[PDB]
Structure 1
Amino acid sequence: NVLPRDLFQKLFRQDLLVASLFRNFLLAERIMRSYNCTPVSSPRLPPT
């Protein structure tokens, strides 16, 4: 719902392990945010 369709299929459909890492990255972004921490990704994602 948040990412543009192009970048979704790039990361979440190409290969399983990357898709799993980014899936779990969204959880990291939420948890670490609550401790004045911001995770960083190379293809910049909008805040989910």
Structure 2
Amino acid sequence: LVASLFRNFLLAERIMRSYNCTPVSSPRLPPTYMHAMWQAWDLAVDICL
């Protein structure tokens, strides 16, 4: 469950950024919003819909 939450939290960090929020986590993660594997997702989704 924790693993599922943190996986998904990475998505939150990426989205909520674009609306002037920043999420926070107690084990403090590094910033992952710019990480290039997101632009893979973007393409993957694009094709797949």
Which TM-score band applies after superposition, normalised by the shorter structure? 0.5 to 0.7
- Scaled by the length of structure 2, the TM-score of the pair is 0.64
4+ long deviations beyond 4 Å: none
**Higher strand fraction (1 or 2):** 2
Q: Which has the higher contact order (CA 8 A, sep 6+)?
A: 1
Tell me the percent identity.
100
Aligned residues: 32
Unaligned runs of 5+ in 1: 1-16
Q: Which has the larger radius of gyration?
A: 2
Structure 2: gaps (5+ residues): 33-49
Superposed CA RMSD in Å reads 0.3
**What TM-score does the superposition give when structure 1 sets the normalisation length?**
0.65
